[PDB]
Structure formats: C-alpha cells, structure tokens
C-alpha cells in the first residue's frame, strides 16, 4: 500500500487529469447554463458543471439531469461513454504496472523491507 | 473460497476499517446536523452519520443529499473522491496478494488439499 501511493499513484493521476481537462472542456460546451430560472441554481459555471460531474461518474455517483437539459443530449451521452472506456484503460494498465517484469519481484521487495 | 475468507479477508478488513475511521472522524465534522426540521430526522449522530455514507459509497449505494446540505460542499466531495482512490488500491493489492510469488504454487495447494 505504501508503494503504490508513494509512486505510483502519481502515474495514474497525471494521466487523469488530462483525460479529465480533455473533455471538461468538451462537455463544458454542451452544458446548457443554470440561470435558466435561478430559484435552485447555485452553479460554480459552465466549466465547473463539467468536471464536477466527471467525478461523479467516475466513483459512481453520477446523475442524468444534465444529459436531459443539455443542447445535444445524444452527443452528450457518447462523450460519458468514451469517458468511462478511457477510464477502465487507465484501470487497467495500472494492475500491468504493478505486475512489472515479474509477479514475485513485487512479493520480494515487500518481504525483503518489511524485515 | 475457503482460502481467502479463512486467511486473507481480516488482511483486506483490518486495513480497510482504519480508512473508514479516518475519513470518519473527518467527514463528521463537515456534514450539518439532522435536527434543522426534525420531522423526518432518525439520525444517529455526527458520526453514525459519516461511516454509514461510506459504507453505502463503497458498495454501490450512495447517494448525494447530505453533500448536498453540508458546510464545505466541494471539500466535501474531495474526500470521497480520495476515499474510493484509496479503496481501489485496497483492491488492486488483494490481487497481487493472492499472486504470492507464483500463480501456479496457489492452484497447486487448492489441488493438493482437495484430493
Ligand atoms: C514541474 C515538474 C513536473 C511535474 C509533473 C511530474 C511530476 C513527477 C511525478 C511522478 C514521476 C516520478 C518522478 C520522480 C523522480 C524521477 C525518477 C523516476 O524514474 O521516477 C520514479 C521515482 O519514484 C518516485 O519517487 C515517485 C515520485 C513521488 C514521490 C512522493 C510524493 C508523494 C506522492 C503522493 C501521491 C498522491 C496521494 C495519494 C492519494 C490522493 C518512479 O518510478 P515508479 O513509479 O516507482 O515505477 C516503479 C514500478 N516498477 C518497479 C514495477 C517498474
Ligand atoms: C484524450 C482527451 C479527451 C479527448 C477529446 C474529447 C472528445 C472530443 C469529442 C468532441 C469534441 C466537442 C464536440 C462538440 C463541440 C461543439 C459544441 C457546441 O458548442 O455546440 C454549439 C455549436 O454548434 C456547432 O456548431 C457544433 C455542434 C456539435 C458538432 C458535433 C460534431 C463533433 C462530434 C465529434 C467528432 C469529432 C472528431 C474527433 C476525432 C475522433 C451549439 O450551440 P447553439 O447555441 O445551439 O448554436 C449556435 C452556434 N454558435 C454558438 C457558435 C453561435
Ligand atoms: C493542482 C490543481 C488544483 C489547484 C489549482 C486549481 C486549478 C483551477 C481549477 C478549477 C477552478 C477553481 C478556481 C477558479 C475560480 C473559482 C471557481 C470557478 O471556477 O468559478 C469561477 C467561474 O467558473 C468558471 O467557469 C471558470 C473555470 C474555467 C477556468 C479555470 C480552469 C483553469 C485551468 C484548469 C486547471 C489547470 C491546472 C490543473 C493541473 C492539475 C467563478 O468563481 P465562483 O464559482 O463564483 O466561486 C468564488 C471563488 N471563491 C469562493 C473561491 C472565492
Ligand atoms: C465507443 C462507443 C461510443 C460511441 C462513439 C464514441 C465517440 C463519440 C463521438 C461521436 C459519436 C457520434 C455522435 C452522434 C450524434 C447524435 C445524432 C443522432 O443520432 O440523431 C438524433 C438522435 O437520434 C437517435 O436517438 C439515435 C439513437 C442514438 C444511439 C444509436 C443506437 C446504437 C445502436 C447501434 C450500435 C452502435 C453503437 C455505437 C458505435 C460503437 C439527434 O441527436 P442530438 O444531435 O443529440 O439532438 C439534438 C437535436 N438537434 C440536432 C436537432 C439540435
Ligand atoms: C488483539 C490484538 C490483535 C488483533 C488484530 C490482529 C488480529 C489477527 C488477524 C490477522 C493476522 C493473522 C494472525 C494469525 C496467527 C499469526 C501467524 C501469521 O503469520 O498469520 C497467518 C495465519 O493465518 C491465520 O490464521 C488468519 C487468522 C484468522 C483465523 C480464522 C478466524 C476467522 C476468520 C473470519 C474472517 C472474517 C469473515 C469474512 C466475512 C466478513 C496469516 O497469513 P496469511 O494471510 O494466510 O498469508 C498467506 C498468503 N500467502 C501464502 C500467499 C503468503
Ligand atoms: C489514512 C486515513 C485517512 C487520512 C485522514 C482523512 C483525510 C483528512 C483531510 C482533512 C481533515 C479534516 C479537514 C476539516 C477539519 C475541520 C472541519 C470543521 O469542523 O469546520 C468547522 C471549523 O472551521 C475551520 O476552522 C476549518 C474548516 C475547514 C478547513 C479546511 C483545511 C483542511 C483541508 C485538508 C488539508 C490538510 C492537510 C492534510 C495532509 C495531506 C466549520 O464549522 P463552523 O461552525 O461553520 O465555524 C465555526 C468554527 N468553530 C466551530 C470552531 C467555532
Ligand atoms: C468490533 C467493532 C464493533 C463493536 C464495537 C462498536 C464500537 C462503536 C461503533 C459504533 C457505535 C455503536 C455503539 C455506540 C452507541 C450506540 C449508537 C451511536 O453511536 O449513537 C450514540 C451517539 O452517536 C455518536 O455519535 C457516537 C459515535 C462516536 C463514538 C463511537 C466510536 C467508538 C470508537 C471507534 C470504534 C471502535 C474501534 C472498532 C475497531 C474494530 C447514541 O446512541 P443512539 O443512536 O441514540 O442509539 C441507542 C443505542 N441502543 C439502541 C443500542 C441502546
Ligand atoms: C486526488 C484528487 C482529489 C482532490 C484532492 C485530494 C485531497 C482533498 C483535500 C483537499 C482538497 C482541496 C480543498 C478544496 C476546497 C474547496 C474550496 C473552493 O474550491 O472554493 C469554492 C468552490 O469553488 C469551486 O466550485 C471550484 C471548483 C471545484 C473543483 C475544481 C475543478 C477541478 C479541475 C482541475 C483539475 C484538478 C483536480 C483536483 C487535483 C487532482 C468554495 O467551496 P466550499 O468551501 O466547499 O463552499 C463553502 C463556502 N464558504 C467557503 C464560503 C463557506
Ligand atoms: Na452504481
Ligand atoms: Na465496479
Ligand atoms: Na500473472
């Protein structure tokens, strides 16, 4: 646990954001403004509602009152598709990582230290 | 089966309880108090409050009304963003825990036993 955090999880997150910044800025566009009728609006703006929701689908905690209230509501449903596809490649190329060259020189260096 | 829950499930529980503790005590200072109206409020504390969102989080049944109505919403979210990258870690090192130095040497003793 100590390796992974201190090292590795850096590499996951850096490639993250990009992936993450990649399409705030796109859905950003799509996002239909809040102050439509401002009686519930306390929004952070069009850039914020973006990522916020990012976050949301990723840990699995989204919703689909955006989706439904957008400009394209179809284009906005295919970037939240490739959004979670991208996100099970990051996933998964990280368990290869962790795996490198060798599935018992990982159990080694955790033996040898722990002493 | 008998492997895992016998020997290597209080490995995953004993690990996991002191980050449910430790976003407990810090997530139970954040979230607002039940008595506002008290006319739907069967609460059972700040901190009763703070572990079971975590619990329902984790498995898959969280929802967002308390961050939602809570002091800091946005530090709210950055801590069960941190909470399900540091479970996923939990995850992804039980897999290389129960690769222990060889895939084969584990289906080697789940055959040896059985016979
Ligand atoms: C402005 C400048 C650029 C900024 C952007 C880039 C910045 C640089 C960031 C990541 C790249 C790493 C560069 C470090 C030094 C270079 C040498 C090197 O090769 O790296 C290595 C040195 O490993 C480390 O030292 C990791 C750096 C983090 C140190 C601790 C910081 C706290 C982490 C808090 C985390 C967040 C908290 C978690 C919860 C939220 C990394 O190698 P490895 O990954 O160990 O691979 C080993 C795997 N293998 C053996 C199987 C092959
Ligand atoms: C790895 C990191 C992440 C990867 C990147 C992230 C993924 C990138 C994916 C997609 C990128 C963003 C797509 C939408 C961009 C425009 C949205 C918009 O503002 O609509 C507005 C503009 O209306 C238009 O003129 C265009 C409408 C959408 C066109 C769809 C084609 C692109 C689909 C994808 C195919 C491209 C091929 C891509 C190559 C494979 C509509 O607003 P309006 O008010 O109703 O109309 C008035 C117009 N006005 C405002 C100008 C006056
Ligand atoms: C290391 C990253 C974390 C730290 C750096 C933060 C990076 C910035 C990320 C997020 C922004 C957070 C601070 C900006 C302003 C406050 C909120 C806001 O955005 O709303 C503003 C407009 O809303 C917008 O639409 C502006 C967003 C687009 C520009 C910001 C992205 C810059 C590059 C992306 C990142 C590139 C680097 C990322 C590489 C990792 C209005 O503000 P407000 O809603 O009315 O609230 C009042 C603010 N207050 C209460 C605080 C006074
Ligand atoms: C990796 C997989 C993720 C998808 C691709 C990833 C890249 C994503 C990038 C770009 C992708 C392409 C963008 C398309 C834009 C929508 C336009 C449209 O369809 O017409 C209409 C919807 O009509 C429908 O309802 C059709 C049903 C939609 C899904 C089709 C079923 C799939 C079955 C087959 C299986 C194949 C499955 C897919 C293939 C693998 C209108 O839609 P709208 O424009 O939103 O409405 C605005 C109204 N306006 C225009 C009048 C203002
Ligand atoms: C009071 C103060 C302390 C309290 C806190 C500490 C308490 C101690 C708790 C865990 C540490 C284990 C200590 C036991 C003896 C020490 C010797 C040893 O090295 O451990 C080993 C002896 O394996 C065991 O005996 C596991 C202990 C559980 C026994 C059955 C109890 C019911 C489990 C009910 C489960 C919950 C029900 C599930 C559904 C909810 C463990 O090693 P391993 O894990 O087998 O590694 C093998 C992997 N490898 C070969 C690939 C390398
Ligand atoms: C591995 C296991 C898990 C690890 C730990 C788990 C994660 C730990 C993360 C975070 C720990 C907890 C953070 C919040 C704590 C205070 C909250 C609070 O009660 O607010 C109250 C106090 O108001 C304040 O004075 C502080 C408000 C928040 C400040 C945010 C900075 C810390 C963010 C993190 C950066 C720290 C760096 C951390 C190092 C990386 C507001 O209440 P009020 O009534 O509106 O105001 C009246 C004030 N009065 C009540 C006193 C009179
Ligand atoms: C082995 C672990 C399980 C067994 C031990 C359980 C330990 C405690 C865990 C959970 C609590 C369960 C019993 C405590 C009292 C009853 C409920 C409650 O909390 O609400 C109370 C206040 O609410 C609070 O805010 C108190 C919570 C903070 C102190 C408890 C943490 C102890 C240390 C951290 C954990 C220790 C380390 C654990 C490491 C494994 C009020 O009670 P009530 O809501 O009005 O309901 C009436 C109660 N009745 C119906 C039952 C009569
Ligand atoms: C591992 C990743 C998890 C995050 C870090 C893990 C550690 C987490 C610990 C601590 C984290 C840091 C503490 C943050 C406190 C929030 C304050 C704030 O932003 O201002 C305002 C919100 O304004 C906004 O809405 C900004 C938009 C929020 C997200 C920014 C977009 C990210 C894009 C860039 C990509 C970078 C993504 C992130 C970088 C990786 C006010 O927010 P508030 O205080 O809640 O409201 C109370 C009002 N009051 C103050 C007046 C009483
Ligand atoms: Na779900
Ligand atoms: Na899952
Ligand atoms: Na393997």
């Known amino acids: 646990?100590?390796?992974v955090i201190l090292h590795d999880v850096?590499?996951?997150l850096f490639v993250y954001i990009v992936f993450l910044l990649g399409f705030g800025?796109?859905?950003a566009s799509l996002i239909e403004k809040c102050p439509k009728d401002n009686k519930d609006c306390s929004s952070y703006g069009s850039f914020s509602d973006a990522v916020l929701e990012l976050?949301?689908?990723?840990?699995?905690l989204g919703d689909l009152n955006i989706q439904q209230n957008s400009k394209y509501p179809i284009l906005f449903l295919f970037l939240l598709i490739t959004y979670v596809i991208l996100?099970?490649?990051?996933?998964l190329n990280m368990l290869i990582a962790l795996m490198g060259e060798t599935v018992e020189?990982?159990?080694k260096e955790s033996?040898?230290?722990?002493?």
Chains 1, 2 share one sequence.
């Open 1 to 3: 646990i100590q390796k």
């Open 10 to 12: 850096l590499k996951f």
């Open 25 to 27: 800025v796109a859905l």
């Open 55 to 60: 976050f949301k689908l990723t840990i699995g």
């Open 87 to 91: 996100t099970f490649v990051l996933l």
């Open 105 to 107: 020189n990982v159990s």
């Open 111 to 115: 033996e040898r230290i722990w002493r």
